[PDB]
């Protein structure tokens, strides 16, 4: 397949970007694809709901009283807005830990507007400012809850990371050896697996949400997955922030799906069963995963929004809240439009 | 044909980027290649030496007394450092123009350190700060020199832009219809032509420098090309700025070559004849042009530096000054090395 997103200047090709995507049902069966839907792919932050599941399944973590917004922050790549930093500090208090216990580092904010404020202030970001700070507090919580020590909670030999590694493989329905591990920007183990299994994780999230809402008896795992979905959809501003794709996406859809960014341009969406999912040929929930081969985020958001339109997910009115991402502005320094974005890719069934 | 630069996280593929490259002799004969060496490509700022030639060949421009550093700024994508703004203003004064005559617009600086200083002072960049401001003053100069009027100097129907279009096609050895035109970020016509012809332009620059140095009877155009080469090599800080690839590259090579960035990740180099170029099998100067298909600038500089090493251009000590670009750091927020860059491409003859 030769599936691309392409930018032009006056009709002349500027850049082209290879697209990979998987659309799967709740059991992970492949329904539609772009590119190579089984591309071995670092999920990066798109794995965070699976890491939050490992946190929430750690015995004793329930006693700390994390609320839904705290869980959404565990699932976040937040913009380090003051509310994200404050909630991180409030979560540290719940587990009687301190910022010095964190093993993630500060970085320039993922939001340009926040980062400009920091620059004006000469603000130096610290550990609680990390976009991953919520995940790290949850990992510290789990380490405290099982009692072997918080030192080294971020290292592969720690039981919290053994729990994460098993949980990821289980949600993917993969043997341990089919998940590879590197080290994240936030200094935790981070997984790679075929792209379609990232879709599978998010189909399982949305499916658990459907079962919870229907009143079905659920395993402890499915109940926790439903809780994670509900937390992300109820507090999408915790998952990213003002003006961010994931937040704007989840607000527009008002509970019908959850979406999550991975660094270097992966994206995952879990869609609750609907007229649209039935029209796509499945009787339950759906999962979507996307990777832009070269890592370009602006192209990722254009492609994800185009894919939602092609799949019929939402309505023109709902998806129109994402118009600035769908068709990125190509306006020069004098206000003249110089080109645009095109989608020469073809979904295959 | 399948030529990539690949980044990894712990040996796991993160992103990959398709590379196109042409290495040509002084007549444009293809000597080595990556990818598609004739890819139709927007040269963007890498066309600036051709545009400077059109300016310098305009009747009467010699009377303004532009010096080598002014010509270097005509060829620049500068960082908007105070010295670039000051030289822009001095060039405007040479032609008795003012900032309001410029038809380029301000933008965030190409240098992070300049841009952070601006953010701290709440500085809003204006036309005089454009990375293309030196080209624009040169175009105003040519318009005024032939009595065409400054108004509209940037529009395709203006005789200055007629001269630019002719000069570009002639340097490429192309018919007019083989060069396509869009509108630049700086609001001028900007050309697209086969990537190898960008290398041809720069081989002609270095060839002319060789012929000037050898005291050959040069055409006036060759003499002006030699002047442009000399100006860029003598004043590389004008062409980009502190810490910028083009500046560090040209300083390391100390007159042996010139190099120039194009936006969306094109690069061009003109190499004077040397033991290295003779070892590559040509008896004259050579040109190099590169495009990263997806537009990533970090990967461009890594690839260009790797190509100089494969081609044997420079000494190991000279190219070690570019080590930070050749293998970009992949260290996380806690100081842990998480990945690297690889060059599985192979130069073909
Ligand atoms: Cl990293
Ligand atoms: Cl533009
Ligand atoms: Zn992280
Ligand atoms: Zn320009």
Residue numbers in the entry:
A (entry chain B), B (entry chain A): 4 to 352
Q: What do the study authors state?
A:
Asparaginases (EC 3.5.1.1), which split L-asparagine to L-aspartate and ammonia, are grouped into three unrelated structural classes: Class 1 (bacterial-type), Class 2 (plant-type), and Class 3 (Rhizobium etli-type). ReAV is a homodimer with an α/β protomeric fold, formed by two tightly packed domains. The active site of the enzyme is located in a cleft on the protomer surface and marked by a zinc ion with an unusual coordination sphere created by Cys135, Lys138, Cys189, and a water molecule. The conspicuous catalytic center of the enzyme comprises two Ser-Lys tandems (Ser48-Lys51 and Ser80-Lys263), centered around the curiously hydrated Ser48 residue and located in the close vicinity of the metal binding site.
The ReAV D187A crystal structure revealed that the absence of Asp187 induced only small local conformational changes and atomic shifts, and these changes are strictly equivalent in the two dimers. The zinc cation is only partially present at the metal binding site, with a refined occupancy of 0.5, as is the w1 water molecule from the metal coordination sphere. Moreover, substitution of Asp187 with alanine affected the metal environment, since a sulfate ion occurs right next to the strongly bound water molecule from the zinc coordination sphere. The sulfate ion fills a central position in the active site cleft, possibly preventing the enzyme from accepting a substrate molecule. The negatively charged SO4 2- anion forms a salt bridge with the protonated and positively charged side chain of Arg47. The hydration pattern of Ser48 is nearly identical as in the WT protein, with three closely-spaced water molecules in the vicinity of the Ser48 hydroxyl group. Surprisingly, the side chain of Cys249 is not oxidized to sulfenic acid, which may be related to a change in the zinc environment. Although Ser48 remained hydrated in the D187A mutant, the mutation completely abolished the enzymatic activity, despite the fact that this mutein can still bind zinc (KD of 7.2 μM). This observation may be correlated with the presence of the sulfate ion in the active site, which would hinder the acceptance of a genuine substrate molecule. We hypothesize that with altered metal binding properties, the coordination site of the D187A mutant could become specific for other transition metal ions, which could be bound during protein bacterial expression or purification on Ni2+ resin.
